[PDB]
């Protein structure tokens, strides 16, 4: 076939891989930053909900 | 007689069964028959007509092309009288060079 | 032992280890572990010869003393902070002792010690669950309180795990204790990764889960323990030393068999956290894994060995064993590498 | 004339060559998902022919 | 990591909001390779129990392809998700945090000054 | 005909280990 | 089905089905002492299952046909030709013993299995407990080597210990000169010329180690050719005992269970026969032993497993 | 592209499908046709390289290197036709699926765009060789021999692995388009050096060079006839594929340390051939000579320069095809008299008279006789190296002078001289042998034509 | 890492015997523990020759510790370069020949001087680079 379509595909190809290169440096960079903030949505680790927690009165009055 | 085995089996010749032996196999008929495998698919198809075919590729690495954007490009360079080629490429009025 | 008996000792045996995977209590673990212990004694002492006796002993000392440390470790973690739940605990001897007691479970450091010597004791069945199941439940609580874990204390193990138990494969004729040599050299390579990311910790676990099947499972098909008596299965079955190497050469991790798939994602991971020469050395060790696989491989099918007369029996008769999920356990096993970005559903 | 068997044992002859027909298929299916840039670099990119509507296929 | 996310209801293979992305088309290259995972065990499968093969048990093998194509299938849109899932939240994330993610300068390379080494 | 394993790197491979020595004589 | 665990499970037992007509009674004696005619009227008298002497084509008799396969492609070995030469170098003395021991340690499995699955007696001639006197008589004028006798105990215990010794056996008593009186009279020509020896090392073997040493674990009782040829007193011998000795009487449907699982499991029961130690007489050749096996193959209904075979007829292979 | 890879897999179930006796012929049939195909993709464009996907593209380099992998892949089969005959028909067909497995992992593998994908069967490719060498080897130290064969590669293959996906953790992606526009200069940072050695050992050791070439002499020689070509003529050239690609981000680190390298290699030709002048094993003699040409292109690829680029690709075509060829000559004679000994059959012109012709064109092609394309590889190498220094010449030089002698002592002590007498065996050559032996040397005269084929992207 | 950090605290070519001090201290406690190990797992059977192997691993750990102290500082004090990693490199080969002088081979202790007379260079190559071999987790 023509040069154009080996030139314009290649471009589509270098497209490809230039987004995919620059995302791969993102994920990098974001999962240092959040593992260590930790203001993120995933590396949440577990806690303690606050549900179980039994605010009735007590048998004593300082509780 | 350490195990029981076998004698190292003589090499057989192909040539004494049935002396038109090709040296394919051991079936006379599959044998001509990889005969005019080997050759036909081997030299006829693959290097008379591939040679063919790799001698008459259409331009490769543009070697004619830059040729003809050769001439054009002296014929008008020296045209005007400023020389025939540039020592300097990328042309240096735009480069913003630092200090 | 009575098929129901033994049904039943396997069906607490596995929700033993359920429990661990599905407790949010410390006291829990324990209790899961415990009477997972409780009920794997009796599936090792089945056969009932003194080699298993001395077996379930040896296996019995190393993870009931595992088991009793770990209560320190809750017991010691409950004293600073008050707190049964499982999360990233707050004290470093806690957290170093509980490594200790868990690893000995798993054996990877000296404590490993006690691996291949059960294993050799015991039936091939047994050393099958033994070498598969009862590695979800230490590994388990790694990964729920990996966060809270000394880098430095467990990559110490991890090295060991994989120097030691890939190093004295070399000197192993029993197949067993190959078997068990290559299973310590596995367990370090997922715990290497663990404090790091534990997606590909689970990841490694199930793939070196199918070889371990596909491997024992087809041991057990061969009825073969000696590497003699395994040299000698290529004149009955062929086929099967054929799939024997087929599995080997995975287990080594040679491209583009599945078993590389783990070893290649463990590097990546560490590489990414700026640990570049920890990745090379277990790399490097992972040829020692290879050699006496290539050992196994040379003597099971690449060549030849002799047979005797006897063997001639065989050829009449056919196995009656079913060898469940056999069939998709090497395939799962063989080839799973073009797959690879499905590890992400671990996630 | 032997037919039956004269496909059975030469039936392997057509795999290959479908396949290089297959293999020009996903040849030509997998560059439409790379069209992206179609007559879209300016160095290539030219007006349109009245009637054609894709420059490469 | 996707371990702790908050809305992350535990045990649920596919979530259902992971129903808003495209599913795999049926003819998935990803697909149709766990289909041959499914044939591949079936050729062995009478190999181990000495049966002939390719020509062995058709109902055996066939079973395995749609097996293995069916698992493959949801295992196939719960790999989707949560790669879906790791780029959501990881653009929420960096429009959250601007400070962190400068916009590095516009400069042509007539301006950047690269040192060149011959080869001599 | 190739070259195949006998007694001898059949008792290569057999023993308690490959890689005997005094202690593993015994 | 078999006796799967799924039919334990489900109730299939084993002590409900046999009863006082099961034992595993073993004829034996002397070369030609007409133990295997002894054996037919104990059989037929009281309704209890037959098993000859096991040959070098026993196991070729189990499987397929029965019919006796090629030496070649089972045996290795000829009992006529260990009798034109018993001190052959190529091991055809010791070949023979081994593969005798195998054929008759898979008929052990046979009676078992049989009795185990119905209930029925057994009645066999020379149980495996007494193949040794050959060996050791065979030992004797050195007509195996040395090497020999450790192989071949080697796979007594790695086997015949599980297999238990059977409830009550009776012998044949006779003396060597009436055997070299009948062995004329039987006339083919490769048993006229054994050897009083090799009659006499069989028979103190017998005297001395095989009847004393087993008869702790099952009731021993001779009997000499008058004494054999009466069928009637036999038979009320035998059935008058209780069977005190031996580790039959006090099992349950545990290891009868455990037991089936292995007898059935006809690789499974002489698995141990194919030790891995290594002897000139008994070890084959890769380059022989890969082309004897694909001569086995490539006979019919083994090329593929039993009811896979389209060669013979199987017919319904793309669906089983 | 798709256009090859699918036919060769393709392939594999008809080899396994096909009748009792056609394997041969139907695996040959199609086995040159792909070959054809092949030729089709020689076509190269003017500078962009013939990019097909993300998954596989080709250049200048790739195509060369494809169309030799196909059309060898034919030759095996003809020459491996006459030891396995006396085989079962599920080995020779177990022994067919492992040569085409290996080619497949050869056309993915030269095609691939991602150096990670360039990695994953550049390891692949052993599985199927030693598989080749260790079960279907007709020796005993084959067993040794192909566990210094994969160790070797190993020791070196995992180190790169650690390598490459730190380049993935830094630079994003490994594409073979997006490393080469995005090229950094390489600091000389200490780290640095240790991150060029490991991207450049793992290639050096499948490209023998001195010191790490001890595998080559005994993979060589006990390897059948069919594994030792396709080791011989495509394997070591992955290699120097990786180089090609891989020293885009290792200027100008390797302006400084290519020194020892290219210590090594030069001295070392000087040294292997020397090994050739004086072997008793006709086949190890071959295998050596393969250590010497391949130093060669060594130190031409370390060099990085124009001319000296396209010389390595030239050689690496042309060395690949007569060490094949050779190959063929040792295994043509060897079953004759069943020895690798090389004066144990002399005379050999006498009682075969077209094999002494074939014989003489493969020793005038490893001679790089001009104008045989390995007159042009090791010519335009001369002139890169002594542009680089004017000394190399010397050595250089004198490695021309060796090669002399060693591949015209071949032919002397086998083909000329007089014959033995005891041997009787020897029966007229058959014809599939001359068969192939053409089929091996016709298309490198064919190549004289056209040097720009396989000049590579530097062209 | 207290003892380890006497050994980094001292500046590389000064302070020779304080660096010889901390450096036979770091092998004299790496025998130790091998020491200990090998009575552990190797019994032995009479206590008098029990403290004799321990004294024999220390006493070679610690003239191996020792050894490459001296080197490394003299040859950073002699040639003013503390910066080059062949400073320890000459260092680490004399602590092999000293384990060929324990061992009374020079096979062993050739071997001895190539291989850790290398890692003597990557371990200096580290310190100088940064790397580290027990990276925290970081992503
Ligand atoms: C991830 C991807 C990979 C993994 C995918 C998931 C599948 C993994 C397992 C694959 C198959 C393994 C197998 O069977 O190999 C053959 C291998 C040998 O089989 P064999 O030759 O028949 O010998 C087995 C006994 O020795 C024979 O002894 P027997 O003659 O007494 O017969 C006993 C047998 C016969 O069957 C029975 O008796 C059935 C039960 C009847 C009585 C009870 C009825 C009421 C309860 C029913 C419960 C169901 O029953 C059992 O063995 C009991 C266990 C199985 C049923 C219970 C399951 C748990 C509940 O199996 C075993 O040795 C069993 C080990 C225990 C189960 C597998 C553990 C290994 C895998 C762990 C990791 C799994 C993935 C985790 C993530
Ligand atoms: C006008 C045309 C006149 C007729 C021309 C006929 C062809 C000819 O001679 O052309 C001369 C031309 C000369 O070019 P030219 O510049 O003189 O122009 C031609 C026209 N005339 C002569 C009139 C000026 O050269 C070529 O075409 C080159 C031929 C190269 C052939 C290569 C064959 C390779 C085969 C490989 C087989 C194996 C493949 C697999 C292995 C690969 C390697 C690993
Ligand atoms: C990744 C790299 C490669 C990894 C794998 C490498 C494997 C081999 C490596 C070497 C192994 C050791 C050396 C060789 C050992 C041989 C083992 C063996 O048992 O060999 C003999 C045996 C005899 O064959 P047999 O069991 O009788 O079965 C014949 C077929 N019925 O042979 C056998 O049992 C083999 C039987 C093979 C049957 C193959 C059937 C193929 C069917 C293909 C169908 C294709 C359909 C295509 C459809 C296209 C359109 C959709
Ligand atoms: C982390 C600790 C790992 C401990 C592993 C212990 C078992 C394997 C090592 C072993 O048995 O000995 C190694 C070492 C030296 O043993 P050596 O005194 O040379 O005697 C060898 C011949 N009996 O003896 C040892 O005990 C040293 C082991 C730790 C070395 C650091
Ligand atoms: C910059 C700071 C540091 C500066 C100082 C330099 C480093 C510390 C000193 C050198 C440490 C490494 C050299 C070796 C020390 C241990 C030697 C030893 O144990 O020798 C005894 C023995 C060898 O002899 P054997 O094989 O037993 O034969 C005789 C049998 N009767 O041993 C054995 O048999 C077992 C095998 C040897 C012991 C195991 C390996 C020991 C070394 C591990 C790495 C230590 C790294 C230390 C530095 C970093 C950490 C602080
Ligand atoms: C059989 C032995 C090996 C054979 C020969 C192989 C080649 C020799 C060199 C081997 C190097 C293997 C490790 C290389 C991995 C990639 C290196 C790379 O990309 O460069 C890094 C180089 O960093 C390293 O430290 C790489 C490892 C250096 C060498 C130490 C380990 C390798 C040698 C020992 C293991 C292998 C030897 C065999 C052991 C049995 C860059 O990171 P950095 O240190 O610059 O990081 C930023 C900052 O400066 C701090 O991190
Ligand atoms: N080595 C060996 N030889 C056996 C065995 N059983 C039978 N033989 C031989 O078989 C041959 C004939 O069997 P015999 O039982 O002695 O005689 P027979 O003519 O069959 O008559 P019966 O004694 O009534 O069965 C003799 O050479 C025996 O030594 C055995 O278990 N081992």
């Known amino acids: 076939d023509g040069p154009e379509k080996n030139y314009e595909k290649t471009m589509a190809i270098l497209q490809i891989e230039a987004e995919k290169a620059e995302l791969r440096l993102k994920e990098l960079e974001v999962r240092r930053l959040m593992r260590a903030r930790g203001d993120g949505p995933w590396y949440q680790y577990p806690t303690i909900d606050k549900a179980l927690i039994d605010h009735s009165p007590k048998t004593t009055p300082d509780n | 007689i350490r195990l029981q085995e076998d004698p190292d089996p003589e090499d057989e010749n192909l040539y004494e069964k049935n002396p038109d032996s090709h040296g394919y196999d051991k079936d006379p008929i599959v044998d001509l028959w990889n005969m005019r495998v080997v050759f036909f698919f081997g030299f006829s198809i693959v290097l008379v007509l591939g040679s063919t075919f790799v001698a008459y590729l259409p331009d490769y690495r543009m070697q004619e092309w830059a040729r003809r954007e050769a001439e054009r490009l002296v014929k008008y360079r020296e045209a005007n009288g400023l020389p025939l080629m540039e020592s300097n490429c990328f042309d240096p009025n735009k480069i913003q060079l630092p200090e | 032992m009575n098929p129901i008996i033994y049904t039943t000792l396997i069906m607490t045996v596995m929700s033993g280890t359920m429990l661990v995977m599905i407790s949010s209590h410390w006291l829990l673990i324990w209790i899961g572990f415990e009477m997972n212990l ?127 138990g890939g190093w ?65 299965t290529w004149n009955k079955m062929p086929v099967i030393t054929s799939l024997m190497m087929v599995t080997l050469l995975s287990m080594g991790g040679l491209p583009p068999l599945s078993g590389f798939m783990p070893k290649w994602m463990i590097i990546q991971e560490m590489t990414k956290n700026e640990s570049i020469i920890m990745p090379t050395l277990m790399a490097m060790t992972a040829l020692l894994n290879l050699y006496f696989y290539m050992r196994l491989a040379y003597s099971s099918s690449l060549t030849m060995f002799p047979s005797t007369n006897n063997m001639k029996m065989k050829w009449q008769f056919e196995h009656t064993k079913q060898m469940k999920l056999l069939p998709t356990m090497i395939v799962l096993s063989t080839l799973v590498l073009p797959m690879t970005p499905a590890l992400s559903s671990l996630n | 004339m032997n037919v039956l068997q004269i496909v059975r044992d030469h039936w392997v002859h057509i795999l290959v060559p479908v396949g290089f027909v297959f293999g020009c298929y996903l040849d030509r299916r997998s560059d439409e998902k790379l069209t992206a840039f179609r007559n879209k670099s300016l160095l290539f990119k030219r007006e349109l022919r009245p009637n054609e509507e894709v420059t490469w296929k | 990591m996707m371990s702790g996310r908050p809305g992350r209801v535990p045990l649920q293979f596919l979530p259902n909001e992971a129903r808003s992305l495209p599913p795999p088309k049926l003819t998935d290259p990803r697909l149709v390779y766990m289909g041959f995972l499914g044939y591949c065990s079936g050729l062995i499968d009478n190999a181990i129990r000495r049966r002939p093969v390719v020509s062995a048990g058709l109902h055996r093998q066939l079973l395995y392809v749609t097996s293995f194509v069916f698992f493959g299938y949801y295992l196939l849109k719960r790999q989707d998700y949560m790669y879906a899932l790791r780029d959501h939240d990881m653009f929420a994330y960096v429009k959250s945090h601007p400070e962190d993610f400068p916009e590095k300068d516009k400069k042509t390379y007539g301006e950047i000054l690269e040192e060149f080494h011959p080869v001599r | 005909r190739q070259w195949q394993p006998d007694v001898e790197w059949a008792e290569q491979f057999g023993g308690a280990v490959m890689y005997p020595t005094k202690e593993t004589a015994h | 089905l078999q006796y799967g665990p799924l039919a334990f499970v489900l109730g299939e037992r084993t002590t409900r089905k046999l009863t006082e007509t099961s034992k595993v009674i073993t004829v034996d004696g002397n070369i030609c002492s007409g133990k295997g005619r002894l054996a037919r009227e104990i059989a037929e008298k009281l309704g209890l299952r037959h098993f000859p002497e096991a040959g070098i084509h026993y196991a070729d008799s189990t499987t397929g046909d029965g019919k006796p396969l090629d030496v070649q492609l089972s045996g290795n070995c000829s009992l006529e030709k260990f009798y034109d030469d018993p001190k052959s170098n190529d091991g055809n003395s010791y070949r023979l013993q081994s593969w005798l021991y195998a054929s008759r340690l898979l008929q052990y499995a046979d009676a078992l299995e049989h009795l185990l699955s119905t209930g029925q007696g057994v009645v066999l001639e020379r149980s495996i407990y007494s193949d040794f006197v050959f060996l050791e008589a065979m030992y004797r004028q050195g007509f195996i080597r040395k090497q020999c006798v450790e192989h071949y ?139 004897v096996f694909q001569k086995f193959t490539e006979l019919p209904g083994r090329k593929y497993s039993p009811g896979y075979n389209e060669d013979v007829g199987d017919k319904w292979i793309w669906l089983k | ?195 060029w050695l490991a991207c450049i050992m793992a290639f050096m050791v499948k490209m023998p060079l001195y010191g790490l070439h001890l595998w080559l002499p005994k993979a060589h020689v006990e390897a059948p006839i069919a594994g030792s070509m396709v080791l011989a003529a495509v394997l070591l050239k992955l290699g120097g594929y ?63 320069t124009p001319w000296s680029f396209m010389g390595a690709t030239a050689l690496m075509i042309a060395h690949g095809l007569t060490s094949s060829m050779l190959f063929c000559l040792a295994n043509t004679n060897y079953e004759r008299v069943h020895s690798r000994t090389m004066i144990l059959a002399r005379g050999l012109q006498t009682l075969l008279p077209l094999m002494a012709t074939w014989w003489l064109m493969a020793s005038l092609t490893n001679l790089a006789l001009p104008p045989s394309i390995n007159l042009i590889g090791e010519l335009f190498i001369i002139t890169a190296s002594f542009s680089w220094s004017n000394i190399t010449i010397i050595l250089m030089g004198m490695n021309m002078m060796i090669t002399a002698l060693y591949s015209l002592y071949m032919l002397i002590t086998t083909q000329r001289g007089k014959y033995t007498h005891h041997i009787n065996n020897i029966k007229a050559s058959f014809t599939r042998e001359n068969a192939l032996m053409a089929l091996h040397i016709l298309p490198l005269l064919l190549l004289t034509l056209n040097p720009k084929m396989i000049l590579g992207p530097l062209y | ?120 260079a990557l371990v200096k190559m580290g310190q100088l680079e940064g790397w580290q071999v027990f990276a925290e987790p970081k992503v």
């Open chain 8, 242 to 304: 990786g180089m090609m690609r891989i020293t885009t981000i290792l200027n100008p680190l390797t302006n400084y340390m290519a020194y020892p390298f290219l210590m090594l290699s030069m001295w070392g030709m000087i040294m292997t051939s020397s090994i050739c002048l004086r072997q008793t094993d006709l086949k190890s003699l071959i295998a050596y000579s393969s250590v010497s040409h391949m130093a060669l292109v060594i130190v031409a690829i370390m060099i990085q």
């Open chain 3, 168 to 232: 004295g494969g070399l000197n192993q004729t029993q197949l067993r204790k190959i078997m068990a040599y290559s299973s310590i050299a596995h367990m370090g390579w997922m715990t290497a990764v663990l404090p790091y990311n534990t997606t590909m910790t689970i990841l490694n676990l199930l793939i070196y889960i199918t070889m371990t099947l596909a491997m024992f499972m087809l041991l057990i098909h061969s009825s073969a323990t000696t590497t003699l008596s395994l040299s000698h």
């Open chain 8, 1 to 195: 592209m798709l256009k090859i890879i699918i036919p060769t897999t393709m392939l594999l179930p008809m080899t396994w499908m096909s009748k009792h006796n056609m394997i041969w012929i139907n695996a040959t049939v199609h086995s040159l046709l792909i070959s054809l195909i092949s030729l089709s993709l020689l076509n190269q464009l003017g500078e962009n390289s013939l990019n097909f996907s993300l998954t596989f593209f080709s250049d200048s380099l790739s195509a060369p290197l494809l169309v030799l992998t196909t059309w060898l892949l034919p030759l095996m089969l003809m020459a491996s036709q006459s030891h396995l005959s006396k085989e079962t028909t599920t080995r020779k067909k177990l022994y067919i699926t492992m040569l085409i497995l290996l080619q497949l992992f050869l056309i993915m593998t030269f095609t691939a765009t991602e150096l990670i994908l360039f990695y994953i069967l550049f390891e692949a490719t052993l599985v199927p060789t030693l598989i080749i060498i260790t079960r279907w080897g007709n020796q005993t130290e084959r067993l040794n021999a192909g566990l210094y064969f994969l160790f070797y590669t190993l020791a070196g293959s995992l180190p790169l692995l650690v390598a490459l996906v730190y380049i993935q953790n830094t630079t994003g992606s490994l594409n073979f388009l997006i490393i080469h526009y995005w090229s950094h200069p390489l600091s000389n940072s200490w780290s640095n050096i240790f991150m």
């Open chain 7, 153 to 291: 105990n080697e796979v007594k215990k790695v086997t015949a210990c599980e297999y238990l010794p059977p409830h009550v056996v009776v012998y044949v008593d006779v003396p060597v000169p009436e055997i070299q009186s009948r062995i004329q009279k039987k006339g083919n020509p490769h048993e006229m010329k054994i050897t009083a020896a090799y009659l006499q090392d069989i028979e103190n073997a017998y005297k001395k180690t095989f009847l004393p040493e087993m008869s702790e674990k099952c009731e021993v009782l001779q009997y000499s050719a008058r004494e054999a040829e009466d069928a009637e007193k036999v038979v009320e011998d035998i059935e008058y005992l209780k069977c005190d000795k031996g580790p039959w009487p006090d099992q349950d449907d545990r290891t009868f269970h455990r037991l089936r699982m292995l007898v059935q499991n006809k690789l499974e029961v002489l698995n141990y026969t194919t030790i891995p130690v290594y002897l000139p007489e008994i070890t084959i050749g890769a380059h022989q032993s890969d082309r």
């Open chain 9, 1 to 120: 890492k207290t003892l380890l950090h006497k050994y980094s605290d001292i500046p590389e070519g000064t302070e020779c015997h304080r660096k010889a001090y901390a450096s036979t201290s770091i092998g004299g406690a790496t025998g130790l523990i091998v020491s200990a190990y090998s009575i552990a797992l190797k019994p032995p059977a009479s206590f008098l020759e029990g403290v004799a192997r321990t004294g024999r691993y220390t006493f070679t750990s610690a003239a191996i510790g020792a050894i490459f102290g001296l080197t490394s500082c003299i040859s950073a004090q002699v040639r003013e370069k503390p910066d080059d990693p062949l400073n320890y490199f000459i260092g680490g080969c004399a602590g092999g020949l000293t384990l060929g002088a324990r061992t009374r081979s020079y096979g062993i202790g050739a071997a001895a001087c190539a291989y850790m007379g290398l890692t003597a």
């Open chain 3, 38 to 164: 409780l009920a794997m004694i009796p599936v090792l002492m089945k056969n009932f010869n003194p080699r298993a006796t001395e077996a379930a002993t040896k296996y019995f000392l190393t993870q009931a003393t595992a088991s009793m440390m770990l209560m320190m470790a809750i017991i010691i973690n409950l004293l600073y902070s008050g707190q049964w739940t499982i999360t990233k605990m707050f004290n470093p001897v806690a957290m170093t002792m509980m490594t200790m007691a868990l690893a000995m479970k798993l054996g990877l450091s000296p404590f490993h010690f006690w691996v291949p010597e059960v294993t050799q004791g015991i039936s091939l069945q047994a050393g099958l669950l033994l070498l598969t199941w009862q590695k979800l439940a230490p590994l388990s609580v790694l990964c729920q309180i990996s966060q809270s874990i000394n880098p430095n204390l467990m990559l110490t193990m991890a090295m060991l795990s994989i120097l030691i």
